[PDB]
Amino acid sequence: DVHPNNTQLWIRYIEAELKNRNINHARNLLDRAVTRLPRVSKLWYKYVYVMEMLGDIPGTRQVFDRWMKWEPDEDAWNAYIKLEKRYGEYERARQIFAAYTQVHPEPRTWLKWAKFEEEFGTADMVRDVFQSAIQYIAETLGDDAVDERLFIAFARFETRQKEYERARAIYKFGLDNLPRSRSMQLHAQYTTFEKQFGDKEGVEDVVLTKRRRLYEEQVKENPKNYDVWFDFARLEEMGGDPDRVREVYERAIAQVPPTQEKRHWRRYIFLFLFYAIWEEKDAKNIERARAIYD
Amino acid sequence: TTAHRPTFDPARGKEALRGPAYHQRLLPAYTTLKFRQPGQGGAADKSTRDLRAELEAAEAAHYAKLKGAPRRWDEDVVFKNQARGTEDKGKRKEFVNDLLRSDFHKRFMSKYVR
Amino acid sequence: SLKRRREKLAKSGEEHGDVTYINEKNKQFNAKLARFYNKYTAEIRDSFERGTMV
Amino acid sequence: VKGGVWTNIEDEILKAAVSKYGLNQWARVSSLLARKTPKQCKARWNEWLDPSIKKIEWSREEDEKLLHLAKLMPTQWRTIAPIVGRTANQCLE
Amino acid sequence: ESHFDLELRASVMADLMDMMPEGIKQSKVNTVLQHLSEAWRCWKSNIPWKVPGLPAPIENIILRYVKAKADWWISVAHYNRERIRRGATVDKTVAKKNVGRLTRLWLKAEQERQHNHMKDGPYVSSEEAVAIYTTTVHWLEARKFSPIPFPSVSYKHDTKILILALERLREAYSTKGRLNQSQREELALIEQAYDSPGTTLERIKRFLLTQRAFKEVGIDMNDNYSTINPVYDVEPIEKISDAYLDQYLWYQADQRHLFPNWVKPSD
Amino acid sequence: PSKEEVEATAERTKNALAALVSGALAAQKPKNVQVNTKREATFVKYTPSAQMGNNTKKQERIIKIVERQRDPMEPPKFKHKKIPRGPPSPPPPVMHSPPRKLTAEDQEAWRIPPPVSMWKNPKGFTIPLDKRLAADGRQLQEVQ
Amino acid sequence: KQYYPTAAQVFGEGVETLVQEEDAQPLTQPIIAPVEQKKFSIQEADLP
Amino acid sequence: PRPDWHPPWKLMRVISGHLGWVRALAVEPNNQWFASGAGDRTIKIWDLASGQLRLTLTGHISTVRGLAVSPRHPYMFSCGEDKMVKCWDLETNKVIRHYHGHLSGVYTLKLHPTLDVLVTGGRDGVARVWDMRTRSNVHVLSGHTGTVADLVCQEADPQVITGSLDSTVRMWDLAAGKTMGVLTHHKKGVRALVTHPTEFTFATASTGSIKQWKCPEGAFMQNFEGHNAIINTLAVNDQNVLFSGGDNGSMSFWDWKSGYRFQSLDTTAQPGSLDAELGIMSSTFDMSGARLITGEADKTIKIWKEDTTATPETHPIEWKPSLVRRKY
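YS: structure for the whole thing
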């Protein structure tokens, strides 16, 4: 009466009854306490734990069902999935993931469902879980807000299944349909995938794209890092895309050193020297080389 | 010594005791309510937009009225003109939200501590 | 829980170094003060150890 | 009489009394040190026993600062001493 | 005052409970009310209050309410001084409380003035100071003033000067029923100076030659009900030296004509 | 609600509150002599139920109830008593939104320093001098 | 010495700052004026 | 529900003169003056158009926390932290009645819209229903376990709604003096309540949370999300502008129907103020809704008005029908 909403007090009373074996008194207190405080997960955890100690697994399921009506957090949904996995009801745990993804539709819970189905289901149901996650997060959050974690986990599941073409298709689709700032790790996983299973030309293709993006970030931070410019220069020359190499050298030239020190002008004039050597030995553009020198 | 203590649980208001009427507590006084008369307003609503209109009318009237809309004895000495720029104090009165630095408090301490 | 209560009573009854207190509640309060404030009072503590400097 | 030299007994009792009584109860502190006045106990804390008092030898920068300030604000030792960083009696001596 | 404290404590506590994030352990909040009391005492003593590691929202609550209490306390000081000056109250406790409040306020203002002098420099400009000094030297050179010497070892009027000084301090003790420790020791120092005038004179002249750092001076306020004024409590051994110097300087300035006729009060 | 529902509400509540105002007035001013001249009788029709132990039906009853003539000089009969107030009505379910997820850094950011007073020591503790001088900023204070 | 900026600096240009430390009207002047009749002759209510 | 457009508000006038925090505000029913109640123990009457000080009334010995000007009587009612509830006759500028009986400081005072009834709430945990004429305390609305911080009176059941620092709101049957319902949705102390003038709904404010409720059953409507502050005040227009005013000095303007926050800003502290002294402590609109009056912990009254030059294309509504799961 003085402290109606005190968790410590409710636990003391419940435990006094349980210690002195007044099980029915204690269960009345547990119903009263989770009625009084339905967002205090301690009282819900104590009640499910007590029923599992008493061996009433239907009673434990009853308490958990009332909790799920209150729509608790992810730890309570996980605890109830783990109850059904403890006692062997994988279809009942499948039903709990259905409700769980409705309440907590984050990538975390979808990936937990996918790992569950990889252990206790079929590859078709793992694929259905992944497709449903992509579709749900697309239709709710938008098509650019689907997560690279979903795409990576789907591709890695197919790689485990030895569906290398399906894994490559998933990686390529995610990279094509996501922004690069939120497909960084998708591209890193794609690079490791091609180093593991792709052919050689695919390996230097994906390494070229990865290092190109890394050097682009480094230039975006420091526009005047001349050795970075030289390495990205050599990367583009080994790639062999002529308009790209010309654009890279033109941006490098436009990066004019504001300091008039000859100690920086060494490397800047040297950069002109490599633009000349590329459009003398690879592009074979003599007029362009003359324009470079002029 | 915990005899002298703070209050963590202040006294809760109670329903009155109920019983027969013997003790005299509250002598009758002002036993008639006054009501707002004709000309005293109160029970006079116009409208929201009407009240808005008289509000900016009155406020614009106040703003418009503010704006105006219809060898020498004193050359022997050593220090000169030392009180220029002193009488020119008094342009605008500044309220200061720090009592110990207000002009009121400075005046008070000058008057009373000597 | 009772066992942890016994163990912490014993380790609190142990005394390493200088007595700065006059009873048990004072000892507990001084330990709490050390837990909170020692990261701010190290120079003053060094001064009280050696006898000088700020 | 109430005064004289400060001994180790008196200084240690003064520190323990300050640890019980703080620094605003010098009459209680002196009541423990009943050979000294409350003013003397306070002066002993302020001029010797306060832990911010440097009793190490003066550096050359400190000496230059002390002479420079004693030239600027003459014989004003209570003013000079916080700027130098030592006590007024230390600066004067 | 007891009621104001009850209301203030309830307000600070309600603010702190509503400020605390859900899930922080919230037993020690009465701790914050102890910090509030200490901050108020720090304000009254003009001591900067700065608890290391106190969370900033809690500090903001305490600073806000210490200022509000300070505003109420100062307004009551103003109101009670106006009542005392008017004579509208004869409550002796109200008068001694009000004099305590005005003493604390005056010393806060005085610390701020001293600090402002150190920060904003000498207010007298160097040109003004040189002009004042030059006027003084030209005056004293025109009056042919002979500067007052340091008192000799064998100054022929030392005993009379010292006896005048000690009589002044003893008559400051004349009508006294209860004496405190410093009062009894100053009486003892005066009778020792009576018994050994030569030794006291040597000690005084040694102090005047050597001492440049002095004891703390107590300050109180004397209430006149219209104004209050500061009263200074100087160490007795220093007071004997100062009274000797006072009598000596007055006698030497009288003999050397330092003060012209317009300077009043005149003997 | 419409004007008719507002006026029905105002009438019902004005009647209930007016009865309580009359009660409060008669409590605040006892009416000098507590006798009434208008001491008429109430009649009550009284159909009884059976009995303690008998289930035979018995006769319908007309009750004449009058308020008793009490002596106007009498003080009240019974001394009042202090009884603790009873428990509240059964507290409702606490309908809070899901709890805020806090970090250990949030807990650390709201921990509160133990106050060491420079004036007060109600329990007479002996505080170490560094702890006593920790909250002083006069060690911090810099003079130029 | 000025320790603080002016209210015009604190609040900007389009903000009107009012320092009101004195009442416009006395305590004897009622906030709501009572209705007085001001009868200075004993005139009959109706025709007698 | 798409928000309606509302112009932003901007600071029109700053009034100084109280020597304490401005804790109470009341506008007289003909929109010519307003009263302010402050921690300097005082009640000031200000001309609304010029913002000008007509009168200072003393008569509380603590902070004035509650002010009401009667629409049917020439009375203003003041409640304060000195436990006192006073009726002021405005035809004499004098206190004429007390409503004595709160055990501690009185935080909130409201007049009944149709009955000659006052309701106060205080630190003694109760709302007290007073008969205005007889000064009679006809109900002690009991059941809260903390201070009754705020309170509203309606003309239909539930006629009294109290919000309390025990984090709880109670709707009360005023005829029987009993609780019809308890709302336990707020996690912190309920400091502000407001009813809508033209639809039968109310809003409650605790720390970081504004809830809207349908009368008479108290059904939950919507949350005004995003004002992360202790909210001291709520004010509502008849043009569906809700103002929330926060103890740290932060202000939000919301569309009432949709819950959309169309303006956020902070108030400014008067010179001399500490940064700890930024805070809105009281608020009302004027009788027309065109002026917001706030009383602030920097001891000021601030008058806010809508920006006349603003346009739905100058200040567009940045609201998209969101599509996430608000985990309620």
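YS: worth flagging: The two ends of chain A are 93 Å apart (CA to CA).
IM: good catch. Also Chains A and G do not touch (no CB pair under 8 Å).
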